[PDB]
Subunit: 599 residues, 3 copies
């Protein structure tokens, strides 16, 4: 019985105390230790070499203890390790082995979940240094790494990056790198107070699947001018996405460098999230250099039902090439988003846009293969002073994009800067159901609402419909002479255009093309013959050889005659129609006409 | 060894029994009590003064015990208290201190989560009395209250309000008032069986952030005529919302008073939820009196992808003023919802509507600043007998609202009651892509589909497109003489209109305005001169001085002549065009024309 | 003290060791066994008759132990049973009693939740046999069954069906049958590796409510030619749905037989999910034979924001009748989905379609009552070789369907096979805002883009708008002479049509109907009189008696004359207009005209 009291006080004591669930005689006869062994916490490993528990705190490095817990649970085929509530667990050194090549702190392992209820906080050892807090690669070379499967991080807890700035722009910092990750997720966690490159990365160059970020918060994760670039979540495996998250930045630097999400492989999504204070909402890009695991096509890309205040662009599309692989982006949907450019001076952040068709990372605009994109049922607003705001900034080659039933209230509808890139554009479709707002009315001196600064446009539709007047704009739509236009439909509805000097402008007379279909208002001077009765009226100018029909948009103030209601043309480029002289006489009128070609 | 058996049976016994996780010699040498101390339940506090456990039941008030648990866990920096499954925990008295000013029962505290697995039920002490079950304010004056942070209530359990009716209409009742709440949430909980004002309130007058209601059920929470008003969730802090919830009412009273959600600050949302039996779906409102914590603008407001059967209005917009603050509502999106007015007699509940632009709480219609709203891709249905159903009831001043690509199948498209308010309307946009259903065909004697009972309309677009005949309606669109109309576009497509006596009606001849752009069908009597050959035809009536062109919508049954295909006007208000007399003779025809002005 | 050591080692030992939470003197004086009794796992029942624990494994049938755990927890009013992580629990025999009529393995019980953290795996006893793993019916006759309430299955674990093929096509296999289920759910679970009929079924013939499938994965659940049919989730109770799930198949058989979801009662939804490798996305159907619990109407049906690669049809609509009940489907929304037909040969799987209006299970096309459906803001793509691809295959009677603001890029827009069914169509609305893609340009020899192979069409709108040329197609829209057409609007925009031989084709001259409203381009030969001055031009053909107006789509290459800009008709079916001869002479021209009737 000495050994009994001794047994009981020893670490095997619980293993000698019997238990049977709820005194049920049909239940297993267990020992207390068996029941305790059903759960596991950091406290079961956070101990000195003699086994005595250590309290966490700013003067204690918890890293080795958490790694020991992960390693052991892994050896039993997995489980969930709780990081207890009511404590802050500090990390204060780098991990070792395969994660060292990633500046890793903790190595995640398959089937080992982390239930973070307390706080995890970086110690000042990491100030001005690279780091990746949680790393799922098991090799410094990602190509030589094994997979991470079935690893979920969740809870009501917090990862706090300590506020430390980057030491050099070339450094990288991350919260969770799942690695070559299959069925991994982060749910519920707040990531805050840092200067980092990413908070979470999913996948590696297309290897991975079914990775998700849900109900997480990301708060103040850029804080310095050193930080080169930031994307809060980088989605680099298929069948993965981000939903119902909150993203907020307060620093000036974030308004110039930070993006919330990057979707970089097929079957990926960004849904139901709120963004504030960022430069950009989401990249949707196929990088040829990332094509190894899931092919060279990014398809089935969804950005839906988000709420955003940003300073640059909401969605940025891209694809590129390497020496041996060509990336392609197609089958994209952008719907249900409500987006605004936050209050800022014109030109004070990257050019404001709902959609950007951006060049590659070396600035090339002639490598892209972007098509089959639907942008529908979104709202976009930019304040009236923001000259640099567009529904779409179309800066690189575009093989198709369709806009239906959006409401865009900003300076430009379609824009690209003159003198810059000259994109080749195919299959740009702007349906009449896009509503153009009035916030920027009166602000558009010298500007074209649709400024078509492209090398060429083919197979495209622009149906312009105003909903209020803006007589400040130079034109509704302008094509420079350098832009070829063919097999396209361009229309300007007459409503709110009566007083406009120019409506559609074709500086190379491109509307004359055999397969150009256009209509727009114009003012035309006519003169009739003197005959009483049915009598022809003819335009005094001769630049209408392309017109197939025209009709009156003006009332007739006269009693003694009427000009024609409708007109066609003649070989010399005059318009002609048949009016009526109740009394004879040569007549001379100025009329507003709808000019039509093949429509 | 006497003291050893004694120690073991004492409440410190577990603190003497050793344990080491899974017999791992690298694990902490702990005591059983340390492992048990990692969790906490109501059972750890639900005890008499001698420490003996008390069983819950209808004759036991569990309030003080649950408060003791919350208070203690709070003192250790937080955690999660389980409310065990398999029991009903009754509450039977008011709390004390700061929550007493709120009729509070339990005080929530920061970082203390409640995992409700069992049932919490109100005892009859609360019958006919006010109460707020869970309160996160710490002061009777909300202005003087501290914050509630990091408080989550979740589980598979239930809050049951006991079925008790209100005692007086002036009383207030609530389930969860998070208070000045930051990162708080309710997930998974069923709230049922009550007569209450709210189930959950988030925030206080704009103070709070990141508060959410997810996957909760709200069932039968209004049951009496005493109940003054009900909104199941009131969202009164930014960056907060409701998603994937279920709301159901069965009482008659709920069909007249209850709303599912109120969104009252910026960056708030209501998504993916199902409603049945309610008067209203969601208020979206900026009250100047609520502007203290987050400014006087409600912007980035999202109502998306909900399913509803309601008896009144789906979304209600509003903003108002106090003596020193002016509220503004802008940047709203309503998309993807499928909504119907449930089976009821006409006029038996508040006027049916998809969108309502409602007056302030004192009935004023001249204080609102509502603009930049997008309503797109929704469906609305009301049964054919429901005279009082509209796509939009526009009852107060409106500074903009845009409708694109909806399907509305109800009695009216645009409505406001004559003789009532006379709203000032700007920037109302009804795109042609809105599909008008046929359920109410033949029901519209004496009614105008678009009944424009406003003081004035400016910068507005109404493109009417029918998809079946309804010859019962008096007109497609009518403007009384009291409504000014300027800088607007009004069109009536001809399809299904051939037999209509009136299509567009302008009782003050407002279509003549300099910047009014309109087109609609009309029947016109013409008579020609007798000349053989090209010969003029002229209208017999003189009310066409505003017409810029017209064209035939009718076949010509004649062989010996043809009327003009197109017409323009003359100063006296006749139409004129040039037809053709194969044989001479004065001709007299009645023709269906499309009348156009500036289009 | 002998009995004390004995007590302590006995199964009542923990019941003698005292504990008080965190040494708090205000806490309950408990015993260790009380605290352990707050949780329950499979280990508490997975024991031999002497109470000794049994290890799970491929040679152990865990079924009776799990049932014992469920039965006991049920007797205490519920709770959550954990299925521990780090182990595979095999099932190797059928259950007994009420579930035997369902081939049941485990019986679920009300208020008893399963937290599946480990793996559950079927033993080879089930090879070639029927089975339903988890069954919530309590009677072999579902009509005589009690309800299952408040039963949630959740966790990070897995249900593995062992890879076994069906033994006979008449067998049924299921993962979870909740039965007559109220407030039940499955969250987080992976179902994999099987040949089954369903993974999860919710409800029974309309009995049930508030059942949900969320964040689950379904992987490779069809593997043989024996498998008759598969729907991964069958939703057979109202106020229930599927959200944020992943569905994947790899077998050839799945491309011909498998559907992801079946929505079969009102107020049901399918949202935010990703599908790959399936034949079909979702059925949306009211079967009269399923109408018992919730009525004969399926209404408030939502399919939104999904991502899919399928081989057959995305959404399939249906309703049918029994001898005494008639099923109805109305108030449906399909929005925000991005869908493609995967790479396959033409005709190698069921006919590709976004929407299918399908016959009943006996092939009848004359029993359906389907109306008030909105399809808006979706994208659909099929590769160019897939002849059998359509936006809508309209194969049974249709009482209404509305398409607004979609982007469809496939072979046909509207299709039904000639010689097959002859549907009666009412209220088909194809708005102009639907964008028709160009992938299948040049592939359409002998084909009509809109192939209207119906018995009749009434109250319908087809506004065709091309966005690129396809001169291979025989026509944009064709109506055989067998299809009646009335009270409808059919338009073909002229853009990209100049070179088309046929645009709209009415093989029975149906465009002449009194209430048919149509416009489309045509080429017409005209000849004038010889008179100098205003001079008539007349068509040489006489098939224009239905034309109310026409206008020029062609330039005039002549200086000495001009044909009319606009035309009307004469009784003999010629067109006539007034042109102008500067010099006299008989003129003869061929002109492209927009032919209009009542528009
Ligand atoms: C911040 C961001 O996401 N910006 C994108 C931009 O992305 C490119 O630039 C960023 C700049 O931070 C990344 O390039 C940096 O990081 C890579 C990857 O780091 C190495 O590999 C990882 C696995 C390892 O853990 C690290 O220790 C490193 O060894 C460096 O190779 C590169 O030199 C450096 O500038 C980003 O790289 C991608 O990062 C994701 C997420 O971690 C990885 O999954 C990919 O493998 C990696 N891709 C490549 C090709 O290496 C760059 O792709 C986008 O290009 C841009 C336009 O689309 O949007 C944002 O600007
Ligand atoms: C039921 C509902 O939400 N109805 C809205 C309507 O809201 C207004 O009317 C309701 C009627 O119940 C509320 O007014 C009642 O309650 C307030 C608040 O109670 C006091 O303050 C709270 C913090 C405290 O816990 C209580 O003990 C009280 O001291 C009373 O002041 C008022 O006299 C009474 O009629 C609602 O008030 C808002 O309530 C939310 C949620 O609790 C609070 O966050 C706000 O502070 C409070 N606002 C104000 C201005 O006090 C009223 O705003 C909407 O106006 C209407 C149209 O938009 O929609 C529904 O009808
Ligand atoms: C695979 C699938 O979902 N296919 C649908 C198709 O559904 C019909 O055909 C399937 C074929 O598997 C089902 O019919 C089979 O199963 C029923 C039901 O099984 C019996 O009842 C259940 C409760 C019990 O547990 C079992 O032991 C059986 O006793 C058999 O009666 C039938 O003979 C057999 O072919 C499907 O039936 C429905 O199944 C759901 C889900 O389990 C039940 O809730 C319903 O009660 C049951 N309905 C009926 C009327 O019995 C058939 O409805 C659809 O018809 C089709 C077109 O819409 O889509 C897919 O093809
Ligand atoms: Na590295
Ligand atoms: Na497209
Ligand atoms: Na060029
Ligand atoms: Na109060
Ligand atoms: Na708007
Ligand atoms: Na007025
Ligand atoms: Na059966
Ligand atoms: Na419809
Ligand atoms: Na027929």
């Amino acid at each position: 019985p000495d050994q009994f009291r001794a047994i009981i006080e020893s670490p095997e004591g619980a293993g000698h105390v019997g238990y049977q669930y709820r005194r049920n005689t049909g239940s297993t006869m267990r020992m207390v230790s068996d029941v305790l062994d059903e759960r596991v916490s950091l406290w079961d490993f956070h101990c000195d070499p003699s086994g005595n528990v250590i309290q966490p705190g700013p003067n204690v490095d918890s890293r080795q203890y958490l790694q020991a817990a992960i390693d052991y649970v892994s050896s039993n085929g997995g489980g969930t390790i709780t990081i207890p509530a009511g404590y802050t667990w500090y990390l204060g050194s780098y991990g070792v082995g395969g994660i060292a090549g990633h500046s890793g702190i903790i190595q995640l392992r398959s089937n080992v979940n982390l239930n973070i209820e307390g706080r995890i906080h970086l110690s000042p050892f990491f100030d001005l240094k690279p780091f990746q807090v949680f790393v799922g690669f098991d090799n410094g070379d990602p190509a030589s790494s094994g997979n991470l499967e079935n690893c979920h991080i969740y809870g009501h807890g917090v990862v706090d990056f300590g506020g430390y700035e980057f030491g050099a722009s070339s450094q990288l910092r991350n919260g969770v790198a799942f690695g070559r990750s299959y069925n991994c997720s982060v749910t519920g966690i707040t990531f805050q107070n840092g200067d980092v490159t990413w908070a979470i990365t999913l996948g590696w160059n297309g290897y991975g699947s079914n990775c998700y970020v849900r109900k997480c918060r990301f708060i103040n994760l850029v804080n310095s001018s050193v930080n080169a670039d930031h994307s809060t979540v980088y989605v680099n495996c298929p069948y993965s996405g981000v939903e119902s998250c909150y993203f907020s930045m307060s620093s000036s630097f974030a308004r110039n460098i930070a993006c919330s999400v990057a979707l970089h492989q097929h079957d990926t999504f960004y849904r139901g999230s709120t963004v504030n204070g960022y430069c950009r909402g989401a990249y949707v890009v196929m990088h040829a250099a990332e094509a190894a695991g899931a092919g060279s096509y990014a398809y089935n890309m969804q950005v839906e039902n988000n709420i955003a205040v940003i300073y640059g662009q909401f969605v940025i599309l891209g694809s590129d090439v390497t020496a041996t692989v060509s990336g392609h982006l197609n089958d994209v949907i952008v719907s249900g988003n409500i987006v605004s450019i936050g209050e800022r001076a014109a030109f004070s952040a990257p050019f404001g846009a709902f959609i950007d068709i951006g060049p590659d990372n070396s600035g090339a605009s002639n490598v892209q293969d972007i098509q089959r994109v639907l942008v529908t049922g979104n709202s976009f607003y930019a304040p009236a002073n923001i000259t640099d705001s567009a529904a779409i900034t179309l800066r690189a080659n575009l093989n198709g994009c369709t806009f239906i039933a959006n409401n865009f209230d900003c300076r430009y509808m379609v824009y690209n800067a003159p003198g810059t890139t000259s994109p080749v554009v195919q299959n740009l479709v702007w349906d009449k159901s896009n509503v153009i707002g009035g916030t920027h009315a009166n602000q558009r001196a010298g500007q074209n609402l649709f400024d078509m600064q492209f090398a060429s446009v083919v197979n495209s539709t622009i149906e312009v419909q105003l909903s209020c007047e803006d007589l400040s704009m130079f034109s509704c739509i302008l094509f420079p002479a350098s832009c070829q236009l063919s097999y396209s439909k361009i229309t300007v509805d007459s409503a709110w255009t009566k007083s406009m000097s120019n409506t559609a402008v074709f500086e190379g007379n491109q509307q004359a093309g055999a397969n150009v279909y256009v209509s727009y208002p114009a003012t035309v001077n006519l003169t009739s013959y003197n005959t009483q009765g049915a009598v022809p009226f003819f335009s005094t100018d001769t630049n209408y050889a392309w017109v197939t029909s025209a009709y009156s948009l003006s009332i007739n103030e006269n009693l003694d005659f009427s000009p024609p209601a409708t007109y066609t043309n003649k070989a010399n480029g005059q318009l002609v129609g048949v009016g009526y002289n109740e009394i004879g006489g040569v007549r001379s009128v100025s009329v507003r006409l709808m000019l039509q070609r093949q429509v």
